[PDB]
Each structure stands twice: as C-alpha cells, then as structure tokens.
Write a protein that binds this DNA or RNA. Structure first.
Lengths: 149, 148, 149, 148
DNA sequence: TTCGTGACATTGTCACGAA
DNA sequence: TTCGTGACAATGTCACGAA
DNA sequence: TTCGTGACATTGTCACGAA
DNA sequence: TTCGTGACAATGTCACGAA
C-alpha cells in the first residue's frame, strides 16, 4: 500500500458509488424485498453532505456481492488521483485499428513483457534501422572491391 | 455519408441519450422554470415504447445548448455500431504511459500519419532492423568460419 | 647459316683436329695398311702452316668416315669464337648435383622451354614470394577487424 | 681422407696424366735440359703397367712444375670414382647463358648458399608463390560465392 | 700440408628444326 | 645436307676450410 | 484478503476535409 | 449545414502476484 488513505473524501467517494449505480438500477441494499430496500434508498440519499457518516451505513444496508466490485473500482480511482498529482504517472488512453492491436498485443503477450515497454522497445528498434541499413551495407559494399584490387 | 439511417431506431438513441444525461443532472429542456421544464421531462420520459415521436419533441422542446453536442454524440453512436459488426472494423482502447505517449504521439506528429500508422510504420521498419541484424549476424557467422 | 667463314684461319683449327686426335690414338687416313696411312701422317704434319693445302689433303687422304664428326666439332668452334667475344654472348657451364638436376632438367622437357629460360622463370615467380606472401598476411587482416564487430 | 686411398690404381692413374699433358706439349722431367727429356718419355711410357714403379718415378724422376698440379687433379679423379657409382652422388654440368648466370650466381653467391642448394631453396619459393596465388583464387572466389 | 669440395673453362659429339 | 644451337660428358685447376 | 496495476469497454466530445 | 473520423477523458471491472 504505497498510497495513503484519506478518511474524509475517500468516504464521500464510496457515496458517489451507491449513486452512479442506484440511478441506472442496481440493488444497493443487502436486502431482497422491494419494501425494505426502497426504504434504504432514502436512508442514505440524505447523507449527501455527510463525511465519514457514510461508513456507518455499509454495515447496515450494503449488498455483499458488491463489496468486490466496489473495492476494485475504489482503489482504481484512488490511484488515479495520486497519479494525477504529476505527469509521468498520469496515464492516457489511445484508439487504433483492430488488426493493429492484434499485432501489438500479440507481441506483448508473446514477447514476455508489458504493453508500455513493448511500445517503448518497438520504437528504439525502429530508429536504429537507419544506421543499421548502412552499417550492414558499408561492411558489405566496401568489401565488394576486394574481389579484384 | 457511408452509413444509412434508421428512422425507426435511429431517433431511438437520442431518447436513450436525453434520459441518460438527464439522469445525471442536466436541463435537456428548452425551458427553465421548475414547472414547464418539469413537465417536458415526463412528457418525453414516456415516448419509450413509441420513440418514433421523440424527434418531434427534439425539434420544439429540447434545449438548444445540446443540439450540436447531440448531432455529434449520435452520429458517433452510429459509426460505433456498424463497425462493431465485423472484426477488422472493430476498435480497441489502450492505456500506455505518459513518457511513451510523448515520443509515440510525437513521432505521429512529425510524420502526420494516423496514430495507428505509427504502430504499422514502427513495426514495419523497426522490424526491418531486426532483419539487418540477421543478415549481419548470419554473415559474420559464415565469413569468419571459412577464414580461420 | 648466319655467321661468316674464315677460309684461311678455320682451316687452321681444322688442321689441329686430325692432328691432336691422331696422336690420341685414332685413324685419320682411309688406308688400312700402315704404308700409305703412315705416309699421310708425315705428309700432314708438314702442313704446319698451310691453309688451302689442308683442304685438298683431307680429300684424297683423310678418312671420309669421321667427316661428320669433324663438320660438327668444327661448326662448334666457328660459334664458340664469335660468341666468346662480347660478355653477354659468352656461354659458361656449371656443375649441379643430380638430385637438383632432375627436377630442373625435368621441368624443361615438360614446360618445353629451354633449360636456361627455365631458371629465368623459376626465379621470377620465386622472388615474387613476398609480393603474395604479404597479400595474404594483409588481405587477411581486413576481414579480422570486421568479423569482430 | 674419407676415400680409401688404394695406391694400386691411383698410381697407374698418374701415369695417364703424365702421358696426357705430354702428348699435348709439356716437360715431365726435373732436368734443366732438352734431350735428357727423351728419357722419361719412353723410359716411363714403357711403364705401361708399373705400380710402385711409376710412383717412385716421381720422387726420383719427374718435372717439379707439376708437383701440386697433380696431387690435386688426382683428388678430383679419386672423388669422381667413388661417386660414379650411385647416381644420388654423381653429377652433370649445364651450359647456360651468361646474363642468366649473373642473376643466378648472384643470389647464390649472396645468400651464402651452394649453387646447387640455391636452386633447391629457390624452387620451394618458386612454388609457394605459384601456391600463394592459388589460395588467393580460393579466398577471392569464396567471397563472391556468397557476397556478389 | 693433405684432402674433400664447389665453381668454371675447354672442347667434343649428338639429335634437331628452318634455311 | 648444311648450320646455329643446346645438353651434358669428361678432365684439370684453384682458393677454402678442417684435419 | 487488500492492494496497485495493467488490459480494455463504453460513450461523450470537437476540430477537420470534403460533400 | 452534414458525414465520417480520430485522439483522448472519464471510469468501472476483472484476474494477477506480492504483502
């Protein structure tokens, strides 16, 4: 755990979680009835401006099989923040032709390495071609003259 | 255009659109007062089963701040469909590191070509360097052998 | 022929011929009996200083059987003389061991060319040893500084 | 001394010599006189076959101008004899041109080798060159097998 | 001094190719 | 046949170097 | 089990070169 | 205008190997 915790906002974060889903429709509560669950819908809706008070509610009305989906989504956004505190870590997304990907990826999984470097190497292996064209050609074209003189 | 329209469903999306955005907080409505605008929410949040009418709702009810944002976001949800059919047309998202991007994009910036052209051109040439190190490796292997 | 003839002088050495050979122990006359044969001898030595005389003498008197041996021994001196003049013209001999003679003499009957010339080449190519003794030592170094890069 | 000096023939040998130079025109007597010469001539010429005779014939009766001339010419014939046997020790002479002799004799007299040997050592080198140009044809050729 | 030895000069045939 | 020509043969010397 | 993290999926945007 | 389109932003999971 290289990224510290922030009880304050890190809690309000989870709050947004039980919202972004409840909106599109997804059993937030750990109950089955649409009577006991519906009730809980408001039991939290009011905790808007309510910090750590949010945690009090997890042990109360929080669907178990969600604890997984959440942790995974939390840590994620958790890293993005700290990583956004500068540039080198700030990641960016890219869209390219399918077939292209297939190669790349297939080259990442086959070239015992991760995408990143795999892209870093595929580059160095390119700019080197220029001086490798002649480097191999010179040692070959300069000797062609030995056949006679 | 390269793709044709589907009035029946096409408009369908927009619906799915105005709702969505609304669900998150937005005045899809062309009005303001918590009344008239309020009605136009339910008045539209119903054409679900008969979306072939949403269009006539957008032409004289939807907030104009979204006319463009839509024609775009839709025209996209359109291409995104037809390509999602086959495989060669499909697409894929990647998440590479900052540093890389610079150099990477940078190259694509100096050549101008597609950001994908970069992976082709880099694989195509950077792979031809993996070639001369082979013709220069099998050569230094049969050159010195005969010699000593 | 090629050279010239010395009517007077050449009869000179020509004379010494039957002479130096007669005292050696051989028949110069064509008379089996020691009466006419011995007569010719005495009559011969008297010509100690006569040219043309020796000519007619050889005719009626000398043994026309060794003639050939003479025409050969005489022709030689014709040549050994005009040649012995200038240096590059004078011929000279040497004693070589059999072993060595073999190869050499045997390279003449194969290559065809004269014995002398034979040595002329044997030498040139030989002396040229360094010329190609270096081409290798040299040409071969050009490949070493390459294979190791 | 390596050659067993067999007084038997070697003596008779001298004879032919004293006889030869005689038939040519040279004194074979220590006599300061003409006539006195007719003595040795026939006196010795009759020794057609005299061992110990012709021998002492010298210490007591023979020209002095030939004392060394003989001791040496004799050694020659002597060596020629034991040598006449096997061809691997006997010899032959050559008639070569002057100019050739020069270069030849030169290197020979120079390198500090015997005339005969000179040729031998010179032949080896005369072949190496003819051999070195060969390895050139193999290497020069094995370069285009692959290269051009 | 004697001797083994290498370098030539001499001088003589011998079998040949082009007058 | 006639010759210039080349390959060796044979035999004597000479100046050296080790005995 | 809790993390960090990398591989990707959806879906919204907007300048752009023709059409 | 209207399309097709490409570079990224936001962010929600999932199955990994070290803690």
């Amino acid at each position: 755990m290289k990224y510290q915790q922030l009880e304050n906002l890190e809690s309000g974060w989870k709050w947004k979680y039980l919202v972004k889903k409840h909106r599109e429709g997804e059993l937030i509560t750990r109950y089955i009835e649409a009577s006991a669950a519906q009730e809980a819908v408001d039991v939290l809706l009011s905790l808007e401006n309510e910090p750590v008070l949010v945690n009090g509610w997890i042990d109360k009305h929080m669907n178990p099989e969600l604890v997984n989906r959440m942790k995974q989504t939390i840590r994620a956004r958790r890293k993005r923040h700290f990583n956004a505190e500068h540039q080198h870590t700030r990641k960016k997304s890219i869209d390219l032709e399918f077939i292209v990907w297939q190669r790349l990826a297939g080259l990442a999984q086959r070239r015992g390495k991760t995408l990143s470097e795999t892209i870093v190497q595929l580059i160095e292996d390119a700019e080197n071609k220029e001086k490798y064209a002649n480097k191999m050609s010179s040692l070959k074209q300069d000797l062609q003259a030995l056949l006679g003189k």
